[PDB]
C-alpha cells in the first residue's frame, strides 16, 4: 500500500489473502483428523474402565 | 404587525447521526418492523454476531479487544540537499546509446514533482513504484 | 446523467483523474476515489484563444 | 543553507542598459513568496524600489523609477531580474534582493532573508 | 431483458406490494426474482426453468 495506487494494488493484495485464507483451512482440516482419532481413543478408555 | 409575531405552543428535539451498524428485520409485507443494535450492550453485539433476535442460555464468543494508538511520530534523516536532477535532464548533450553514461545521485533530497513539471516528459509509466508516490518513500541509491 | 463543464490548461488535463493530486485537483475540483462515467477533453485554440 | 545568493560587482558605461539577477540555493519560492530590492549608496539610507509576487504576478515600482526599472520574477530557476537603461552618476551603488522564507501555507511578517548585493558603478 | 437486466426463466403474475420508490426485488441469495414492468407498472416474478 505504500508503493502502489488503488489500481494494480488489489491485484497484489488478492494474491496474498487467498494465500493466508488457505494455510488456515488446511490447519483446521488436520485438526478434525486429529480430534476424530482421540475420541475413538477416549471410547476405549471410558469401556476398559 | 411587520414586527413580532404571536404563535402557538410547539416541540422539537434535535439528535446527530453517527457511524453505527444495525440488524434489521422485514416481516412477509417487506416492511421494516424491528431493529438491534450492534455496540450498545453486550446482549446486543452477541444477539448481532448470532444473527437472532433471541439467545439460548451459555456462553458466547464475540469480538476482540483492542488499543488505539494515541499520537503518530515521523523519523527522518535531516540532509535537505535538494538532488541535482536538473543536471541529467537540462544537459546540452547526452553520449550515444552504445555507450550510455550512467551518473550516480546520492546523500540528498529527492523531488519529483519538477520532474513532473514539464510537458514533454509524457511517456512516464513506472513498473515497481506508482509514479504518483515517489514522495513518500527513502531510496538506498 | 449529468455533465460538469469547464475549460482549462493543457497541461492540467492530467490531474482530473481520479486519485490524482497537484494545483486543479486540490482547489478547483476534485473527483472521488470511486468513480463511474468518464471524461472527455478536446483541444479547443481556435474558439477561446 | 536554505539562502539567497547575490551577482558580483560590475562597472557600465552610461546610456546603456543593466542587468541584475539575484539567485537561491536550497529554497524555492513556491506561490506565496515575495521579495523586494533595495539599493544602498555610500554613506547614505536606505531607499526602497519595489516588490513583486511570485504567485499573483502583481508588481509595484517607486514612482521615481517608474519607467528606469523593469521587475520580472521567473518560477523555473525560482529567482527575480532586474532591467534598467541609461544609468547616471548616483546609480554607483549597492543592490540587494530581500525575501522571507514561506512555504505554501503561511510565514513570518518580516524580511530575514538577504543577500550581499551588487555594486554597480558608472564610469 | 427489463433495462438492461438479463436473465431466463418463466414470469408469472405476483401479489408482493412494491412502495413507489422500490423496483427490484431480492432473496437471501442476492439476486433479482421480482421485478415492475416499465411501460405497464404491473409487479412480475421470476423464477428458473
Known amino acids: 500500500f505504500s508503493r502502489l495506487d488503488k489500481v494494480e494494488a488489489e491485484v497484489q493484495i488478492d494474491r496474498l489473502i487467498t494465500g493466508r485464507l488457505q494455510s488456515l483451512q488446511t490447519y483446521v482440516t488436520q485438526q478434525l483428523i486429529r480430534a476424530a482419532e482421540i475420541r475413538a481413543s477416549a471410547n476405549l478408555a471410558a469401556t476398559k474402565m | 404587525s411587520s414586527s413580532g409575531w404571536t404563535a402557538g405552543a410547539a416541540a422539537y428535539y434535535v439528535g446527530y447521526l453517527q457511524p453505527r451498524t444495525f440488524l434489521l428485520k422485514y416481516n412477509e409485507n417487506g416492511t421494516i418492523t424491528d431493529a438491534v443494535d450492534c455496540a450498545l450492550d453486550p446482549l446486543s453485539e452477541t444477539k448481532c454476531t448470532l444473527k437472532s433476535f433471541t439467545v439460548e442460555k451459555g456462553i458466547y464468543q464475540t469480538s476482540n479487544f483492542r488499543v488505539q494508538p494515541t499520537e503518530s511520530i515521523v523519523r527522518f534523516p535531516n540532509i535537505t540537499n535538494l538532488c541535482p536532477f536538473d543536471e541529467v535532464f537540462n544537459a546540452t548533450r547526452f553520449a550515444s546509446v552504445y555507450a550510455w553514461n550512467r551518473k550516480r545521485i546520492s546523500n540528498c533530497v529527492a523531488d519529483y514533482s519538477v520532474l513532473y513539471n514539464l510537458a514533454p516528459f509524457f511517456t512516464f509509466k513506472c513498473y515497481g513504484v506508482s509514479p504518483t508516490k515517489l514522495n513518500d518513500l527513502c531510496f538506498t541509491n | 446523467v449529468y455533465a460538469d463543464s469547464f475549460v482549462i490548461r493543457g497541461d492540467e488535463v492530467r490531474q482530473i483523474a481520479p486519485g490524482q493530486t497537484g494545483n486543479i485537483a486540490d482547489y478547483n475540483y476534485k473527483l472521488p476515489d470511486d468513480f463511474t462515467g468518464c471524461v472527455i477533453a478536446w483541444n479547443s485554440n481556435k474558439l477561446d484563444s | 543553507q536554505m539562502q539567497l545568493v547575490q551577482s558580483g560587482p560590475e562597472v557600465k558605461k552610461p546610456g546603456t542598459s543593466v542587468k541584475v539577477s539575484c539567485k537561491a540555493s536550497?529554497?524555492?519560492?513556491?506561490?506565496?513568496?515575495?521579495l523586494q530590492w533595495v539599493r544602498q549608496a555610500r554613506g547614505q539610507r536606505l531607499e526602497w524600489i519595489g516588490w513583486?509576487?511570485?504567485?499573483?504576478?502583481?508588481?509595484n515600482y517607486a514612482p521615481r523609477f517608474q519607467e528606469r526599472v523593469t521587475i520580472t520574477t521567473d518560477k523555473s530557476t525560482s529567482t527575480a531580474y532586474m532591467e534598467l537603461s541609461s544609468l547616471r552618476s548616483e546609480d554607483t551603488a549597492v543592490y540587494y534582493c530581500?525575501?522571507?522564507?514561506?512555504?505554501?501555507?503561511?510565514?513570518?511578517?518580516?524580511?530575514?532573508?538577504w543577500g550581499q548585493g551588487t555594486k554597480v558603478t558608472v564610469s | 431483458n427489463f433495462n438492461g437486466l438479463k436473465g431466463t426463466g418463466v414470469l408469472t403474475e405476483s401479489n408482493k406490494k412494491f412502495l413507489p420508490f422500490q423496483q427490484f426485488g431480492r432473496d437471501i441469495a442476492d439476486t433479482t426474482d421480482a421485478v415492475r414492468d416499465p411501460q405497464t407498472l404491473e409487479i412480475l416474478d421470476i423464477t428458473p426453468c
Open positions: 530581500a525575501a522571507p522564507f514561506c512555504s505554501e501555507t503561511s510565514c513570518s511578517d518580516g524580511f530575514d532573508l
Open positions: 536550497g529554497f524555492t519560492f513556491t506561490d506565496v513568496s515575495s
Open positions: 513583486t509576487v511570485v504567485g499573483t504576478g502583481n508588481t
